[PDB]
RNA sequence: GCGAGGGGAGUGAAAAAGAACCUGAAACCGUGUACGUACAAGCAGUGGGAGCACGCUUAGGCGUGUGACUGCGUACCUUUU
RNA sequence: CGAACCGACUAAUGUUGAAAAAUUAGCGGAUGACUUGUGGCUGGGGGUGAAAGGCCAAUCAAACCGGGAGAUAGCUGGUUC
RNA sequence: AAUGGCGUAAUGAUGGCCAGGCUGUCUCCACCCGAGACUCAGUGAAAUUGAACUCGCUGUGAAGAUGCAGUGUACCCGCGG
RNA sequence: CUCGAUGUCGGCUCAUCACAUCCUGGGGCUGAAGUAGGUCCCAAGGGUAUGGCUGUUCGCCAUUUAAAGUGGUACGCGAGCUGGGUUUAGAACGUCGUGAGACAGUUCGGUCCCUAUCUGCCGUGGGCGCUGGAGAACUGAGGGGGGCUGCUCCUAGUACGAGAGGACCGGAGUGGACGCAUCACUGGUGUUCGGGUUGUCAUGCCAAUGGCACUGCCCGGUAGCUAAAUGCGGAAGAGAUAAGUGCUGAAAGCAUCUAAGCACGAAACUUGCCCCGAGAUGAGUUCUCCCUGACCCUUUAAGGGUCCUGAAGGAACGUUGAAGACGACGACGUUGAUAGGCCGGGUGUGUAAGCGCAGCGAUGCGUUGAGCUAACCGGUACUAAUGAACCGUGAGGCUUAACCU
């Protein structure tokens, strides 16, 4: 299966993720969502970022929201949320990826790295 | 979510900690997260309110660390443990408003009051 | 874990069945018209064909 | 009445908002019929099947010759079939990875249960309390100590003891199918499927009845 | 065993396996042949050859281990100066094994590993 | 192995008296040979009994060994109703 | 408060042990009715005892050794062609 | 009510109950690192033991049977647990 | 029957049977409208609660559930765990006694041994046998596993009902508990991968590294293994029934389910589904492969024996494995990817080392998302898998039936 089963993993991510996110991107990655009866709608979740660049299904990037109370969406890469497109918080990743320091406060995940 | 287990009120009239003492669904339901009905027990409460302290009632589960996922498989885990008591035998969510976010599965048909409040998800 | 009457004879003489030893069978290899041991070339000099261990 | 083929891993087709597609790639490479019998010295219907790239060069001998009975290309181990009113040695002697069996329906599979080798109570059941730390007396995993005192007993034959493990049949049953690409041999299911790339599987229609 | 591909061990601490295997690894370089069980042997080459590849660099890279894998930089210096450039051709592979077997007292296979000098050439008899 | 141990040769009436040394039994442990023996239940024998290995005889229907198959059929002692 | 030192509250292991009382992790006292080396003094119905019938050489509701002694045994066992 | 009565700060490896923290004690176990367990080479125990050709079931019977009766079943022999 | 020892109650673990059935299944009567019940018959497939108090069994109480069955199994289960109750020695209270002490009272403390020979089991190999020897694919006599059930909607707010309420039959979805498989997802682990950091010894020193201190402490994580994760299964359908229901029908001018004679009828029984399965000695079937050289002595149909041959195949060895305690089982052995190495990629860590510059310096920035990187994926014979040797033969017993020259 040089290029056969490992083949679907490829014939689907042909997308244009972010290719380079340095945390804190508080974007609502418009996520298709759904709602019922009508509405297709599309809304997202403000981010922080820590992922896993893996197994085709780049099922990750626990986006981290503090809206009112507490925590994460492990929003994959594969099709139903109209791209991560927006990266607003530049970078400055502490011990880089896997910056899981769940503790809400004046302890910014200081962004900015230009 | 197994007996014991401290759960917070996400609605009102009987603050803070609330003790889960059972899990319905039948014989041997070990857990129950997402948005199942759960027999609760108030242990703190604000001096006021119309629901005092130590009132064995049942309730729902709004935000639970165990997570909730579906579709794509992505998950929404809320590190908290939401109750939201319901006036017991004439089932219905007792209270006025709900606090914080809620779950999209919580919008389960027969419920509905709770989700038109707590502006979120 | 104690035992009680046990027959030295017959019994045991049966388990011994799965206890007999075994035979090899191997070659001599081109050079050594004998030894070669098992799947080895030869120990005399420890060479399969030349300078291996010690030889000419 | 169907074909068998090596499992070979499994993946999904993570739909946009789903991933429902959770099959398991089961390269369904066609077979080689031509071999069967009826009432003149044998059993019932039956139908031999063989598919793989066995080194016809050197490994298996008698079977290659046994295959000469009007066949083509000897693969691995041959399996049989049954009634269904199929073709025969009277037209070709070469099945395919698709015909009239239908589509979208559910197709059961039977990989080869791995085998964790010897296993115990706790293992072959996943049930037996106790501790470890202040224990060190009955340190959990024990059979948990099972039997009587002074009783007929017979340790009761068949009671779940340690036992071992190892390649074994299975049969999942059900399991719909999301896709298929004939010739290309690419059958998909929906998770499950026993074995782990090192099996064979029979992939039958669905003995649901 | 349990279920699939993992491995590499013999009764010993993996906390200490590094030494019981590194000193021995630095020996092949010091010499050529070393009788030491099919196990230690069949296991030895993964520390010798992988450390052999550090030739092409002959800079900071090769020196990823000098002051550590051996008190003296003897063996390491012997590498990027001799062993490295020796087998420069067919990179893959290197050390071979030749069964000796039977260790006296405790019937354990011996072998001894090697590396070059005895090229697989249809040589004749010399020296 | 300038071992142990042994094999010859010689001492001797004898070493089938070699220092472990007179005679050397029994338990117990082996090698060899004849027969029985891997679909059959139990104090293992006893009664019947074919076959097989040898031995019989100027056949004459036998002796020795072993025993397939088969009727039976729960050791001895003590203490006790 | 806490090492040495002295002691032994808990659990696991050991229980044909490493060990006829210990090992491992904790635990109590630690300038005192403290702790320890050497030598001395109390003798069996006797000693010593912050007292448990505890200790008096792996022995204690009366030490060990030798003797009266073949104590006695209306009991158990065994009893030979 | 000094074979003391009722209190009592302090102290307690002391008995009973509650709480916070804490957690594999538990729901419910998973993985991993080591010492055994397994395999090879060397050395080499133990208690026990009338004799064994040492199956299940129902009944029998000194009253809970591998050994009796009926019957069912079961090729021969190891190794791990 | 046991006193030359058969360990007590309760708990844990793990059970196995009965039926006098708790739930679910099928019926009869009801003072049965419906819904729910009452009772009796049939029925053992499967299922049959977590806690508070107490040593408890039990019980009462809180809250579930379709339901929280009764009982046998040395009041099942200590050469399997526990040691809370209860009989050792310590001490105390009440009470008894002049007292030693005692209690069918209470109270605090108080050593639970055994490496399994036989039967029995769970797994798993070695013989030999199935009549020439092999390699395979089956048949299926038998054997086991599995058999739970909630809620909702439609039917139908209909039948029924004064309303209140609310079905049957049949169907559709989603659950609880249980079972099997499997890591693609979510996660755990991941002392063999990367990083941070405390103390200290060393590699001459700076720098950079390494040993040790639980992997020193710690952050994260590949593969694999995994549950809390994911996917599927307890079904329909048949046969013959249980109770029950009946038809037609006399004995017994009617009647009658029965005596002749037909028909229904349950999670029980046979089967259907999954696994094992020809040692099924009653050793079955089918397909394919291999062996067609000479003599001798007997007590001659029984053979015994020598030389020449040795195939198909098996095994042995080696490289190994998602296979495994060892055996077994699978892959590969130069006609080669079977291991290891090597190339590339993935991944995980998180921007190395060195050099340059800024800053007194700690330190920072650039080189640079670098450096390193495993069990992984794609590929590559570099190393090791050597040519032979070993076992297994040489055309297959008699009798009869059918085919024949």
UniProtKB/Swiss-Prot annotation, chain D:
What's one GO BP annotation on this UniProt entry? cytoplasmic translation
Looking at the keywords, is Ribosomal protein present? yes
In this chain, where does the modification N5-methylglutamine occur?
150
* This protein's UniProt keywords: Methylation, Ribonucleoprotein, Ribosomal protein, RNA-binding, rRNA-binding
**GO function term, MF aspect, one:** rRNA binding
Could you name the domain of life of the organism this protein comes from? Bacteria
Q: Which InterPro entries match?
A: Ribosomal_uL3, Ribosomal_uL3_bac/org-type, Ribosomal_uL3_CS, Transl_B-barrel_sf
What is the annotated signal peptide range for this record? none
For this record, an example GO cellular component is: cytoplasm
Question: Mind telling me how this protein is modified after translation?
Answer: Methylated by PrmB.
Give the sites modified to N6-succinyllysine. Answer: 38
Is Nucleotidyltransferase given among the entry's keywords? no
Q: Which PROSITE patterns match?
A: RIBOSOMAL_L3
Which Pfam families does the annotation name? Answer: Ribosomal_L3 (PF00297)
Entry similarity comment: Belongs to the universal ribosomal protein uL3 family.
Q: What does this protein do?
A: One of two assembly initiator proteins, it binds directly near the 3'-end of the 23S rRNA, where it nucleates assembly of the 50S subunit.
* Subunit structure comment from the entry: Part of the 50S ribosomal subunit. Forms a cluster with proteins L14 and L19. In pull-down experiments interacts with CedA.
Q: What is this protein called?
A: Large ribosomal subunit protein uL3
Name the species this protein comes from. Escherichia coli (strain K12)
Gene label: rplC
